[PDB]
Design an enzyme around this catalytic site. Structure first.
Site: not given
Ligand SMILES: *S(=O)(=O)c1ccc(CCN)cc1
Length: 199
Positions: A63, A160
């Protein structure tokens, strides 16, 4: 425009992420961030103006990405503290489990906690991402791609994912219930031959 860790950037004029770390590749300017923030070629804007595009990316599996920044813009080897200051970035030495760490991003600003695990796999909707480091600083949707770093200025990685609650963040639960996952910065610099801007 000034490129600075933690600040908001838009992707395709549609979604939002946060700058990871200013970098250079020879004379080319850029910054590292999360791969899930944009496909290859996606147009990046900071402060109401086009600054570049996603040069390369890997997601899922990894990622990671870097955005090449046009020469008209300035790189700052620092991260915003979301109260008018910056924290100088001085290297990328990796910190051990238990060490203190902070992160910076456009939704929750500047947040601190500890490194709590390494080599974690996140089973995202898009697929598995392996090798992630977990901390318990909180974060929210939009902080993705943003800087993780020790207070002494060693870059750890880029935001991430993690266990956001229905309000879109995990700041409403105590740190002990938090899982906030970042992609280690070391392999991103190595894969793309990028150098941290330091100060
Ligand atoms: S990012 O840190 O903006 C972020 C974190 C967690 C999510 C939830 C979906 N995996 C989405 C984006």
């Amino acid at each position: 425009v000034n490129v600075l860790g933690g600040i908001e950037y838009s992707i395709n004029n549609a979604t939002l992420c946060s700058v990871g770390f200013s970098v250079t590749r020879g004379a080319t300017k850029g910054f590292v961030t999360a791969g899930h923030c944009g496909g290859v070629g996606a147009i990046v804007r900071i402060g109401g103006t086009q600054v570049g595009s996603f040069a390369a990316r890997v997601f899922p599996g990894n990622d990671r990405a870097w955005v090449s920044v046009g020469s008209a813009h300035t790189l700052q080897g620092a991260v915003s503290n979301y109260s008018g200051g910056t924290i100088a970035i001085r290297g990328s030495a990796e910190a051990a489990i238990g060490a203190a760490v902070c992160r910076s991003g456009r939704t929750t600003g500047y947040r601190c906690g500890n490194i709590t695990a390494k080599n974690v796999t996140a089973n995202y909707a898009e697929g598995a991402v392996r090798g992630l480091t977990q901390g318990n600083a909180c974060m929210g949707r939009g902080d993705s791609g943003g800087s993780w770093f020790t207070s002494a200025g060693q870059a750890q990685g880029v935001m991430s994912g993690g266990n956001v609650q229905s309000n879109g963040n995990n700041c409403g639960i105590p740190a002990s219930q938090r899982s906030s996952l970042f992609e280690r910065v070391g392999p991103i610099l190595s894969q793309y031959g990028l150098s941290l801007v330091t100060s």
